[PDB]
Amino acid sequence: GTNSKYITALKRSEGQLRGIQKMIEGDRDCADIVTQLTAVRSSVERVIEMIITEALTECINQPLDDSEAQKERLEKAIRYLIK
Amino acid sequence: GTNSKYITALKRSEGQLRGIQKMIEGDRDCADIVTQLTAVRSSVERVIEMIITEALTECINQPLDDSEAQKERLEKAIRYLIK
Amino acid sequence: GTNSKYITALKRSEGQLRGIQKMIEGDRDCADIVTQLTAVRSSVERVIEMIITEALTECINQPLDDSEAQKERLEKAIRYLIK
Amino acid sequence: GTNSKYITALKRSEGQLRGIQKMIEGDRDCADIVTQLTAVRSSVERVIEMIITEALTECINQPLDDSEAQKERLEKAIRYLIK
Ligand code: NA
Ligand code: NA
Ligand code: NA
Ligand code: NA
Numbered sequence: 607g608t609n610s611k612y613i614t615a616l617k618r619s620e621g622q623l624r625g626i627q628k629m630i631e632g633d634r635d636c637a638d639i640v641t642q643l644t645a646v647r648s649s650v651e652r653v654i655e656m657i658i659t660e661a662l663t664e665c666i667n668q669p670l671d672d673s674e675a676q677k678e679r680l681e682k683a684i685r686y687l688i689k
Numbered sequence: 690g691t692n693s694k695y696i697t698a699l700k701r702s703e704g705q706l707r708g709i710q711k712m713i714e715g716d717r718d719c720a721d722i723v724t725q726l727t728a729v730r731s732s733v734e735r736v737i738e739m740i741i742t743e744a745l746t747e748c749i750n751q752p753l754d755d756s757e758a759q760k761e762r763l764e765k766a767i768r769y770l771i772k
Numbered sequence: 773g774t775n776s777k778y779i780t781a782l783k784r785s786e787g788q789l790r791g792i793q794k795m796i797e798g799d800r801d802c803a804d805i806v807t808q809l810t811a812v813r814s815s816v817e818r819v820i821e822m823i824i825t826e827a828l829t830e831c832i833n834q835p836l837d838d839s840e841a842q843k844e845r846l847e848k849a850i851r852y853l854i855k
Numbered sequence: 856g857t858n859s860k861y862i863t864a865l866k867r868s869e870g871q872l873r874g875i876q877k878m879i880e881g882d883r884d885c886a887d888i889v890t891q892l893t894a895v896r897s898s899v900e901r902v903i904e905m906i907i908t909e910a911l912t913e914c915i916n917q918p919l920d921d922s923e924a925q926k927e928r929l930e931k932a933i934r935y936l937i938k
Contacts, residue, residue: 613793620789627779636827643820650813661802662767666760677749684745687770696876706869710862719910726903733896744885828933832926843915850911853936854904
């Protein structure tokens with residue numbers, strides 16, 4: 607929703623990508639550009655992991671009343687995590 | 690346990706590693722050696738994924754009677770998956 | 773420099789991150805958000821790879837006159853690639 | 856060749872895989888099994904990296920007399936590294 611910390615994290619990566627575009631415009635050292643691009647990649651990776659973790663924790667902690675349906679829901683969610 | 694398919698998969702990788710040792714003894718082309726080592730890596734990765742998936746599915750489908758304790762058990766198990 | 777295709781690729785990822793921010797604002801399905809974030813991650817990965825490849829190809833094809841210094845230059849560049 | 860340290864490293868991983876097979880036979884904790892399998896994966900990854908690095912360093916330091924052919928040889932070798 608509106609104030610979510612994942613919006614803020616991705617807005618940081620968005621701005622960093624703009625900075626990296628300038629580094630390329632300026633023929634900056636490939637190593638600096640790669641370092642910064644790797645940081646953006648790692649930040650995106652971290653957001654993916656935290657979003658999946660939040661989704662699964664919500665699944666677990668907001669169960670369906672039907673315990674059998676809840677198992678199947680959790681199973682669909684975990685095999686998504688692992689893959 | 691005794692007849693588990695993951696033992697068999699890892700015994701395949703064990704034998705493949707022996708073959709790769711021979712390729713190195715024989716100064717075989719680095720590309721062939723790397724291809725085979727990558728296959729072993731991928732097989733180990735696959736066993737990791739299937740073992741985690743089995744463990745979490747067993748968690749889900751063999752719950753504790755205490756539903757609150759079961760949630761905490763699943764949560765400990767999923768954050769292990771994601772990380 | 774000014775018109776580089778890597779600027780354009782990263783500007784695409786920048787815009788996609790803005791779209792993903794909206795998906796989070798809108799509590800869109802985690803799976804859709806993760807799919808899109810993974811695409812951004814993969815695009816950043818691809819830019820990293822192409823920038824390193826370009827840098828090493830330029831190293832190789834614009835050698836120093838001193839062949840021994842050029843070897844050391846290439847070696848510093850390849851161990852950067854592998855790591 | 857005969858005494859190569861990469862044979863020894865892979866023989867360590869081979870033996871570790873045998874140990875992990877026993878852990879599975881014994882229904883050891885998934886987390887211990889995964890930790891050990893991850894170590895094997897990381898060791899295989901490290902051997903891949905060191906073998907590629909050695910191959911490229913040998914390319915660089917044992918050039919063809921034909922400098923143009925040597926460039927093409929290095930280029931084929933680096934794009935293999937990056938990919
Ligand atoms: Na949150
Ligand atoms: Na099994
Ligand atoms: Na270019
Ligand atoms: Na060696």
